[PDB]
Design a binder for this molecule. Structure first.
Ligand code: CLA
Ligand code: CLA
Ligand code: CLA
Ligand code: CLA
Ligand code: CLA
Ligand code: CLA
Ligand SMILES: CCCCCCCCCCCCCCCC(=O)OC[C@H](COP(=O)(O)OC[C@@H](O)CO)OC(=O)CCCCCCCCCCCCCCC
Ligand SMILES: CC1=C(/C=C/C(C)=C/C=C/C(C)=C\C=C/C=C(C)\C=C\C=C(C)\C=C\C2=C(C)C[C@H](O)CC2(C)C)C(C)(C)C[C@@H](O)C1
Ligand SMILES: CC1=C(/C=C/C(C)=C\C=C\C(C)=C/C=C/C=C(C)/C=C/C=C(C)/C=C/C2=C(C)C(=O)CCC2(C)C)C(C)(C)CCC1
Ligand SMILES: CC1=C(/C=C/C(C)=C/C=CC(/C)=C/C=C/C=C(C)/C=C/C=C(C)/C=C/C2=C(C)CCCC2(C)C)C(C)(C)CCC1
Ligand SMILES: CC1=C(C/C=C(\C)CCC[C@H](C)CCC[C@H](C)CCCC(C)C)C(=O)c2ccccc2C1=O
Ligand SMILES: CC1=C(C/C=C(\C)CCC[C@H](C)CCC[C@H](C)CCCC(C)C)C(=O)c2ccccc2C1=O
Ligand code: SF4
Ligand SMILES: [Ca+2]
Ligand SMILES: [Cl-]
Lengths: 143, 40, 40, 141, 731, 150, 80, 31
């Protein structure tokens, strides 16, 4: 229906259309202000002239939150998975702490370059049972 | 004019009284309980 | 010698090299394509 | 115990010593023999010169005496192990404290009673719900 | 050595130093730790304390009535409640000069007086009290009631009247009496009072203790109550043109349900409040017939608890009756929690659905009451957690509550604390990052790049109740939903009240509200995390697995094992106090700034500056302080001078707490020993000997005093700001 | 030094610095109110802090915006130091225990066992951040104020 | 006065007595460990509670425990 | 109308009662 009636697109917004002609330049490109005037003119705006983002889950604004959410989660899972796998790899080499202080670059890089398939590796470790642990085998404190 | 309310000769005594009453007695009470002492 | 190859691969040197590299990536990306509040 | 024989150490007096309460309530004294005349640091401040042979010094509390005792045997090559710490009452009553049974409490010795000894683990202490409203603690029982 | 202070604990009495005094005060009400205190004398002393405390509350209320009826301009304020400022109490300070004298002679009084901001004039004129003599009679009645309760306590301390321990440990009767009588009968009698006095007084009809037996509150008496038809009390409701205190636009209805706001007073309708109290009185009376007593029929809580088991929860709620019934700290922690939640609810309801006439227009009283109740509740919740930690320390039985839902909480406490930490990080990181991003983006002359998230999930809920400014067309916002065609009498009033752009009923929110709400969520998650890790790890851990043997509050354990500072369950409370104060600062900044925007018609300022922190630091703190700091100037002195002095006073106390909190004891013990030597060597002064050997404040006392000074300087400073900045632009 | 530098900064702006007229008269910035307003704490709170801090908070959109940013940033670091200065490590180690259990649950605990900062190091980080935040606040404030007087 | 206890987990290494600065702790012959000795606390009247014993304990968690109590002139460490 | 002058004096005489009863309860709670 008329979702976000109090919000008008930047293409129709009054204060936004007033301010878009007078946008500053971020980089060295003098058109960058008018570039923003043309780029942000598609989003929904408020009566103040600033763009608003809707994150309720609708696909109309999947470029507002969905794409950065997925891109982050991908890169962050990459980071955490290569870190966890390298931490486990250290546990069998000489001195498990010294190699945590001094990085094994030929090993850390080898594990980083194999992180683009971290979801499949994680599911294969969960089905086999390598991802999680058992409560009866973890050091716990007195209750 | 200070007291537009009834019985304006009460707030006076009431303010001094609380001034030289409650904390005087309070500080003296702890003293008195310190007095029993105990020379063995 | 390996004594310096181990120093260049220590925790602080590597954790600052990665931060410098990621800073370069982000700075150049927001140089060529700045002002990305969302995805078009 | 019977008599506190000893020479007062060479010291020009300091403000860190004993006070009025330390003379009226209780003070502590330590007696030791020095193999020669040397300089030692005062637990109250400064540096004093201990006399040759039997020495005597009065302090405020017991920890000062034991801090001087732990200094005597560790810093000097002719180590002093015969320092004896006494507690002095306002009635002249002097009693023996350190060393207790003539031997330092470090090494073991025959003729001592087990004080504060428990026959359990710390993780075996009783629950505080079982002893509440009683004037006892989980460690006192 | 022992003396006689205190007389309840020999350990504190045998202390020959000054500490003997301090711990003699901080253990005054800790009855469980007294010498030889039994389980029955405990409950009985606590009962007498309850009696005395009810008396104290009633005496405070009696004084509040007395000063209004004596020094207040109640009758004048009744005439013009929208222009005459109320009077709290008169000033009797022999220190005033000329500026304060010329200033405080305000609010129509002929003497230096203090304006009233507790919002009691509106309450008293909404009740029906229109003369000072009614207030005086009520004050005398309360002065008698307080003595009644004092004598009740004194008499119950006697052995013949001493209640038994089995009487105190009766749960199935205390509830049936508190619900049907203390809640049901009280609500019913208050509804009767509202119908018999408030409604007639709203129509010019005076009904007092001299004519209420003859004058009916309705043209038709009690027979139409017996008639199965009840529409006659809906009757002709008070029209939208009704005027308070007069028979103009007034009808004969007493029990309605039309809803909405009174267009003149901008408050709730009296008939609706009386009908509400009647309905909930019936409900509470019904609740008062659930648990069995001396007549067989009824429930037994011990059976209901022990019967609700679970395939995933093991023992369920077994033995929880014998657990809670014997733990006073458990009961106090539940009571404080529920009371704090309903206090925050009272705060969050009175600002948008005011029940008192002309109270919405006075902005300072309304700004003060909300913040007052919110701080009250913020202390109540921390108390609810501090007493749960004490339940774990003193009253938790691991064999009685074995395998139940309570012990499983201890079995997986690591996971609870871990996920609380995760969600607090997940909040803090991004909320702070977005605020810093907005500041960085605005500072660079590019306000067109702010990450402004639209609060969809809350504006949609607003739409589910009739808010059409967003236009979601859901439930009450949609004219075709079956929820509107129900013939509900309250619908037309609610729909008119919600969407009028003049009230505080469901205010229009934006991205700034979203960001401040996530900062509030952080403040809740982290404070609860601290208060929950303090309660769970109150019996032991891996640093101190024997924490249960050391009690609740203790200094530490020593510098060994790496360090043990602030390790007790009391220290966790001490830490979480700061987080509660910070959350209550954030919440109050939010409320006050948005209400300034609503009151000045400048909702745009708040909706367009609350997204970056500089907006708060400047357009709120720096902007609204101008009058505050100008209470006393080198040019003159106005009525804000006392607040201008209290602001700096609160700053001073708050900064004084930092000394106790940053520097610790040993420094001060050495500095004190130097002074002891100084006195015992000063001629004409060593002859001034002391019985109490002066010692430095303990570490626990250090943290307590520092937190107390911090809290005083946190509350007083913000109050001197909130009242002064409000009584200027609108007061 | 916080009072020393404020004494300097206000006495110079009030009884020394100021524009000189071509006739000979000298009009100071704060109109010479130091001798008549710096005698009370409210004078320093209003006519010194509140009055002369306006250049820093209103610096957004200009070349002095970085100074307002660093002003708020020092206000941040100051309060961040209070977490260390008011607490004790015995709580933080018990919390690290739960986070270690969480890491071992997924088997992601470092062989370097995590230990909270020592008591001395806790105090050191506290005082370091206290001084850093305060001096950054005063630096930003002083520079934004001195650059905005012509 | 403070309370000092010694549990059966003690290995009798005299470290807590070598660290005690007020001659509060001793060593009595026992029959539990290789050293055949256990810590003892006869002179609790001289115990200030500086936890120097607990700091110098080797066993998994302490074998000697100090529980602070009613502080007196001697336990407060008063020298004036 | 405003409040009378003698009634303010009647207030202290009545307030004598809660003070006295609170004193009794206070001394009974000390035990
Ligand atoms: C391999 C590194 C690694 C991995 C896989 C994890 C994984 C996890 N951490 Mg964690 N952590 C790490 C390092 C890591 N951490 C470090 C170095 C610190 C010290 C700053 C922490 C401090 C920390 C805290 C305080 C908490 C967690 C928590 C968690 C759990 C929830 C995820 C989270 O909190 O969001 C994200 C995690 C963080 C924001 C913490 C910082 C993450 C660091 C900066 C990333 C490490 C990168 C590493 C160097 C990569 C090595 C690559 C290798 C080839 C050399 C999760 C399973 C939470 C928990 O208890 O579970 C609910 C929690 O409270 N961590
Ligand atoms: C329990 C709440 C309460 C509080 C906080 C106060 C506070 C105050 N009262 Mg008060 N008073 C109270 C209850 C209270 N009263 C009640 C219930 C009565 C009826 C007996 C009175 C009758 C009363 C009188 C007659 C006077 C005060 C006065 C005062 C002020 C002087 C301090 C004083 O000595 O008080 C009073 C001590 C005992 C009542 C002070 C601000 C004086 C005043 O007006 O100051 C300007 C004054 O004259 N009070
Ligand atoms: C932690 C929360 C957070 C989030 C979600 C964002 C998100 C964003 N920031 Mg940002 N930022 C943050 C914190 C955050 N910031 C903080 C704390 C600072 C202060 C140092 C900044 C300072 C900052 C600047 C100076 C700029 C951004 C910009 C941006 C946008 C560029 C995205 C991009 O580069 O394309 C995708 C990247 C790789 C594919 C993006 C939407 C840029 C912008 O123009 O905003 C629209 C930009 O100029 N941010
Ligand atoms: C219909 C009968 C009735 C009524 C009206 C009350 C009313 C009250 N009882 Mg009560 N009680 C009753 C029956 C009743 N009780 C019975 C039968 C028992 C035996 C199980 C108890 C046992 C009991 C205890 C142990 C306590 C109370 C307390 C209270 C007071 C609650 C505190 C308060 O004032 O906050 C406000 C009230 C409503 C908002 C309140 C006035 C408490 C108290 O204050 O002590 C005096 C308290 O400690 N009652
Ligand atoms: C109905 C309200 C209520 C009641 C009856 C109590 C009662 C009690 N509290 Mg308590 N408390 C409350 C609310 C309450 N609290 C709230 C709201 C908080 C949060 C601010 C606290 C936080 C708190 C702490 C941290 C502690 C207590 C403690 C105590 C006990 C000793 C109090 C004392 O004499 O110290 C002195 C009284 C004035 C100086 C006592 C039985 C102490 C205790 O030992 O628990 C058993 C203690 O450590 N309370
Ligand atoms: C402005 C002051 C300040 C700040 C920023 C914090 C921040 C925090 N407190 Mg805290 N606290 C404070 C004052 C403060 N406190 C005070 C005065 C007290 C009373 C003593 C407490 C008592 C307290 C307790 C008891 C607890 C906390 C906890 C926390 C953490 C909760 C996690 C979170 O918020 O998510 C995210 C984190 C943040 C938003 C802060 C990080 C900000 C930095 C700038 C992020 C970027 C890192 C930076 C680039 C590092 C590089 C530095 C480089 C320049 C050298 C958090 C880091 C809880 C905790 O430990 O969490 C589990 C906890 O239990 N606090
Ligand atoms: C908090 C704000 C919104 C945030 C999202 C909500 C999640 C909040 C975090 C809680 C996580 C829950 C973890 C469950 C942990 C868990 O899986 O436990 C397992 C449990 C299984 O219990 P059983 O089937 O054995 O139940 C038998 C009972 O008799 C218990 O003995 O499942 C549930 O309890 C489901 C309900 C969750 C109950 C916990 C929270 C309930 C929320 C409040 C409900 C209010 C209802 C109306 C009351 C008036
Ligand atoms: C619908 C969606 C959202 C709603 C989202 C919903 C409400 C969130 C639901 C969250 C649920 C409750 C939790 C999800 C998963 C919980 C399990 C336990 C995840 C476990 C992950 C662990 C096991 C991963 C571990 C390892 C993974 C594999 C990779 C890492 O590198 C490293 C490391 C961390 C060690 C909203 C907010 C409404 C906005 C809308 O636009 C989109
Ligand atoms: C024989 C009897 C009957 C007749 C009863 C008659 C003829 C009168 C009955 C009156 C009754 C039964 C109750 C009246 C209660 C009045 C109360 C309880 C007032 C309480 C006031 C309180 C508690 C405090 C009020 C306050 C004051 C003082 C203030 O000024 C400030 C506000 C606030 C603090 C609220 C009938 C046949 C009908 C039924 C059967 C029993
Ligand atoms: C420490 C501890 C403890 C704890 C305590 C506490 C912490 C408490 C609390 C609590 C709380 C703080 C709670 C809260 C909550 C929440 C809730 C309860 C909710 C809800 C919901 C609902 C139910 C709703 C519904 C609805 C809606 C949704 C809207 C509209 C209306 C309706 C109704 C529909 C104790 C002592 C026990 C024991 C010991 C330990
Ligand atoms: C100053 C200071 C002292 C010394 C403080 C002393 C000796 C207290 C002196 C205060 C005197 C008693 C006057 C205080 C006045 C109070 C307002 C009186 C309140 C008492 C009520 C009964 C009213 C400490 O012992 C200490 C310990 C641990 C951390 C920080 C500190 C610390 O900062
Ligand atoms: C939080 C806290 C901790 C815990 C503090 C910790 C664990 C420090 C966290 C350090 C993290 C792991 C490193 C992040 C900070 C880096 C030094 C910044 C370097 C960034 C570069 C790599 C760019 C204490 O140990 C403590 C001790 C005594 C009193 C108070 C406290 C206290 O408040
Ligand atoms: S607590 Fe300190 S003073 Fe007491 S016995 Fe142990 S080491 Fe000695
Ligand atoms: Ca009337
Ligand atoms: Cl001034």
């Amino acid at each position: 229906a008329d979702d976000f009636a109090n919000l008008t697109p930047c293409s129709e917004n009054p204060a936004y259309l007033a301010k878009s002609k007078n946008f500053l330049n971020t980089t060295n490109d003098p058109n960058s202000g008018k570039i923003r005037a043309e780029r942000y003119a598609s989003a929904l705006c408020g009566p103040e002239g600033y763009p608003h983002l809707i994150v309720d889950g609708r696909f109309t604004h999947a470029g507002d939150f969905l794409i950065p959410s997925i891109l982050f989660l991908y890169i962050a899972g990459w980071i955490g998975w290569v870190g966890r796998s390298y931490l486990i790899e250290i546990r069998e080499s000489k001195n498990p702490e010294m190699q945590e202080v001094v990085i094994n670059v030929p090993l850390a890089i080898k594990k980083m370059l194999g992180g683009f398939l971290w979801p499949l590796a994680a599911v294969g470790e969960y089905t086999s049972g390598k991802l999680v642990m058992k409560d009866s085998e973890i050091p716990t404190s007195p209750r | 004019m200070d007291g537009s309310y009834a019985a304006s000769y009460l707030p006076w005594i009431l303010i001094p009284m609380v001034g030289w009453l409650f904390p005087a007695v309070t500080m003296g009470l702890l003293f008195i309980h310190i007095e029993s002492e105990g020379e063995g | 010698m390996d004594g310096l190859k181990s120093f260049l691969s220590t925790a602080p040197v590597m954790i600052m090299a990665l931060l410098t590299f990621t800073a370069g990536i982000l700075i150049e990306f927001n140089r060529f394509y700045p002002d990305l509040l969302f995805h078009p | 115990m019977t008599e506190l024989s000893g020479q007062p150490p060479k010291f020009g007096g300091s403000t860190g010593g004993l006070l009025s309460k330390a003379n009226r309530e209780e003070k502590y004294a330590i007696t030791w023999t020095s193999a020669s005349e040397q300089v030692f640091e005062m637990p109250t401040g400064g540096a004093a010169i201990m006399n040759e042979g039997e020495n005597l010094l009065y302090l405020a509390r017991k920890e000062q005496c034991l801090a001087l005792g732990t200094q005597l045997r560790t810093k000097f090559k002719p180590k002093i192990q015969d320092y004896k710490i006494y507690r002095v009452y306002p009635s002249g009553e002097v009693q023996y404290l350190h060393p207790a049974d003539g031997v330092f409490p470090e090494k073991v010795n025959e003729g001592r009673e087990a004080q504060g000894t428990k026959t359990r683990r710390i993780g075996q202490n009783p629950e505080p719900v079982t002893i509440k409203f009683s004037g006892k603690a989980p460690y006192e029982v | 050595m022992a003396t006689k202070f205190p007389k309840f604990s020999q350990d504190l009495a045998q202390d020959p130093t000054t500490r003997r005094i301090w711990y003699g005060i901080a253990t005054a009400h800790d009855f469980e730790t007294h010498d030889g205190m039994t389980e029955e004398n405990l409950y009985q002393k606590i009962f007498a304390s309850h009696f005395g405390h009810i008396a104290i509350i009633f005496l405070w209320t009696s004084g509040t009535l007395f000063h209004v009826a004596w020094q207040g301009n109640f009758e004048q304020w009744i005439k013009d409640p929208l222009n005459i400022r109320p009077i709290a109490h008169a000033i009797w300070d022999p220190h005033f000069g000329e500026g304060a004298v010329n200033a405080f002679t305000q609010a129509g009084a002929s003497n230096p007086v203090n304006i009233a901001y507790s919002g009691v004039y509106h309450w008293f004129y909404t009740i029906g009290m229109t003369t000072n003599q009614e207030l005086y009679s009520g004050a005398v009645f309360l002065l008698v009631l307080a003595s009644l309760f004092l004598f009740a306590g004194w008499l119950h301390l006697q052995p013949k009247f001493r209640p038994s321990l089995a009487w105190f440990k009766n749960a199935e009767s205390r509830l049936n009496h508190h619900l049907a009588g203390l809640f049901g009968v009280s609500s019913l009698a208050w509804a009767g009072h509202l119908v018999h006095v408030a409604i007639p007084e709203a129509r010019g009809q005076h009904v007092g203790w001299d004519n209420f037996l003859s004058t009916p509150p309705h043209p038709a008496g009690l027979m139409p109550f017996f008639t199965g038809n009840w529409g006659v009390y809906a009757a002709d409701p008070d029209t939208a043109g009704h005027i308070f205190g007069t028979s103009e636009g007034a009808g004969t209805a007493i029990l309605t349900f039309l809803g909405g706001f009174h267009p003149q007073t901008e408050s709730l309708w009296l008939t609706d409040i009386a009908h509400h109290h009647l309905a909930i009185a019936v409900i509470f009376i019904i609740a008062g017939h659930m648990y069995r007593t001396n007549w067989g029929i009824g429930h037994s809580i011990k059976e209901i608890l022990n019967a609700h088991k679970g395939p995933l929860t093991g023992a369920g709620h077994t033995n929880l009756y014998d657990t809670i019934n014997n733990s006073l700290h458990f009961q106090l922690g539940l009571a404080l929690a529920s009371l704090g939640v309903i206090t925050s609810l009272v705060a969050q309801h009175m600002y948008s659905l005011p029940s008192y006439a002309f109270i919405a227009q006075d902005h300072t009283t309304q700004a003060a009451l909300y913040t007052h109740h919110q701080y009250i509740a913020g202390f109540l919740m921390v108390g609810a957690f501090a007493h749960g930690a004490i339940f774990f320390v003193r009253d938790y039985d691991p064999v009685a509550n074995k395998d139940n839902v309570l012990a499983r909480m201890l079995e997986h406490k690591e996971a609870l604390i871990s996920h609380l930490s995760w969600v607090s990080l997940f909040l803090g990181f991004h909320t702070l990052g977005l605020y810093v991003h907005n500041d960085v983006v605005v500072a660079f002359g590019t306000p067109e790049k702010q990450i402004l998230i639209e609060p969809v999930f809350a504006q949609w809920i607003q739409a589910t109740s009739g808010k059409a400014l967003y236009g979601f067309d859901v439930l009450l916002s949609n004219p075709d939903s079956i929820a509107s065609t129900t013939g509900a009498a309250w619908l037309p009033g609610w729909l008119d009240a919600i969407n009028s752009g003049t009230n505080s009923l469901f205010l229009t929110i934006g991205p700034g509200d979203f960001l401040v709400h996530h900062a509030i969520a952080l403040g809740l998650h982290t404070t609860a995390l601290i208060l929950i890790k303090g309660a769970l790890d109150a019996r032991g851990s891996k640093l101190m697995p024997d924490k249960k043997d050391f009690g609740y509050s203790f200094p530490c354990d020593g510098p060994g094992r790496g360090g043990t500072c602030d390790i007790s369950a009391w220290d966790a409370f001490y830490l979480a106090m700061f987080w509660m104060l910070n959350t209550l600062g954030w919440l109050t900044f939010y409320w006050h700034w948005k209400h300034l925007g609503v009151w000045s018609g400048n909702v745009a300022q708040f909706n367009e500056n609350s997204t970056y922190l500089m907006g708060w630091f400047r357009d709120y703190l720096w902007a609204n302080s101008a009058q505050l700091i100008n209470g006393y100037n080198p040019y003159g002195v106005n009525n804000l001078s006392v607040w201008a002095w209290m602001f700096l006073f609160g700053h001073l106390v708050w900064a004084t707490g930092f000394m106790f909190l940053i520097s610790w004891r040993g420094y001060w013990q050495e500095l004190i020993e130097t002074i002891v030597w100084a006195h015992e060597r000063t001629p004409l002064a060593n002859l001034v000997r002391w019985k109490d050997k002066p010692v430095a404040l303990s570490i626990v006392q250090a943290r307590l005093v520092g937190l107390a000074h911090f809290t005083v300087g946190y509350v007083l400073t913000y109050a001197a700001f909130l009242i002064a900045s409000t009584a200027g632009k609108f007061g | 030094l916080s009072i020393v530098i404020f004494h300097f900064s206000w006495k110079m702006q009030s009884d020394v610095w100021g524009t000189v007229s071509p006739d000979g008269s000298v009009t100071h910035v704060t109109l010479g109110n130091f001798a008549q307003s710096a005698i009370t704490i409210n004078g320093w709170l209003r006519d010194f802090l509140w009055a002369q801090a306006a250049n820093v908070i209103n610096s957004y959109g200009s070349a002095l915006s970085a100074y307002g940013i660093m002003f708020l940033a020092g206000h941040f670091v100051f309060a961040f130091s209070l977490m260390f200065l008011f607490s004790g490590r015995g709580y933080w180690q018990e919390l690290i225990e739960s986070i270690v259990w969480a890491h071992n649950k997924l088997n992601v605990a470092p062989a370097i066992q995590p230990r909270a900062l020592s008591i001395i190091q806790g105090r050191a980080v506290g005082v370091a951040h206290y001084l850093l935040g305060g001096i950054v606040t005063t630096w930003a404030f002083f520079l934004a104020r001195s650059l905005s007087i012509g | 006065s403070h309370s000092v206890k010694i549990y059966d987990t003690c290995i009798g290494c005299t470290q807590c007595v070598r660290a005690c600065p007020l001659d509060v702790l001793e060593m009595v012959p026992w029959d539990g460990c290789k050293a055949a000795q256990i810590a003892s606390s006869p002179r609790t009247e001289d115990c200030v509670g500086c936890k120097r014993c607990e700091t110098a304990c080797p066993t998994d968690f302490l074998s000697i425990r100090v529980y602070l109590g009613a502080e007196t002139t001697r336990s407060m460490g008063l020298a004036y | 109308m405003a409040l009378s002058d003698t009634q303010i004096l009647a207030a202290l005489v009545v307030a004598l009662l809660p003070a006295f009863l609170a004193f009794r309860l206070s001394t009974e709670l000390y035990k």
